[PDB]
Swiss-Prot record:
The chain holds residues 23 to 108 of 108 of the full protein. GO terms for molecular function: ribosomal small subunit binding; RNA binding; translation initiation factor activity; translation initiation factor binding. One of its GO terms (cellular component) is eukaryotic 43S preinitiation complex. The gene is SUI1. The factors eIF-1, eIF-2, eIF-3, TIF5/eIF-5 and methionyl-tRNAi form a multifactor complex (MFC) that may bind to the 40S ribosome. Interacts with NIP1. Belongs to the SUI1 family. It comes from the Eukaryota. One of its GO terms (biological process) is regulation of translation. It comes from Saccharomyces cerevisiae (strain ATCC 204508 / S288c) (Baker's yeast). Keywords: Acetylation, Protein biosynthesis, Translation regulation. This is Eukaryotic translation initiation factor eIF-1.
Length: 86
RNA sequence: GAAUCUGGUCAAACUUGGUCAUUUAGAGGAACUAAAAGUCGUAACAAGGUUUCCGUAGGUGAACCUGCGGAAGGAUCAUU
């Protein structure tokens, strides 16, 4: 219930994927993704992991930025928005 | 011939408005360099992995991409 998980997938040594999973489907994804792209200056994607967790994919270790964005916009509590160190 | 006074006259100045320039405030806004063990890509240099470039229009994390027409500064100085 409301568990939004941010998870780093390390690809090639230092080059990384910030995968944000479980974002609410009331305010649409595309706009949010675009905003993130503008802010992060890094590429973002929409991933459909076996139709259970819809993922906003981002490039690079900018989890802090994601957190900040959440605080600004939709992630109100910072309790059910969880961070993986990996 | 003294103050004084009518008309001029040159007219400082003063109240007005509007031009300008030196300036310093400049709420905020976008730039640019210098720093070059941040972040993401890798665009260009090799046919640099879609050859690059120009002019232009559109698009968009960002290098940029794509139309259309030109260049080669091309990777062709070549067909009885
Ligand atoms: Mg080729
Ligand atoms: Mg390249
Ligand atoms: Mg190339
Ligand atoms: Mg030259």
């Amino acid at each position: 219930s409301n568990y939004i998980h941010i998870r780093i997938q390390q690809r090639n040594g230092r080059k990384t994927l910030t995968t944000v999973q479980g974002v609410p489907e009331e305010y649409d994804l595309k706009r949010i993704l675009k905003v993130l792209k503008k802010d992060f200056a890094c590429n973002g994607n929409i991933v459909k992991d076996p139709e259970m967790g819809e993922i906003i994919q981002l490039q690079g270790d900018q989890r802090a930025k994601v957190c900040e964005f959440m605080i600004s916009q939709l992630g109100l509590q910072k309790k059910n928005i969880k961070i993986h160190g990996f």
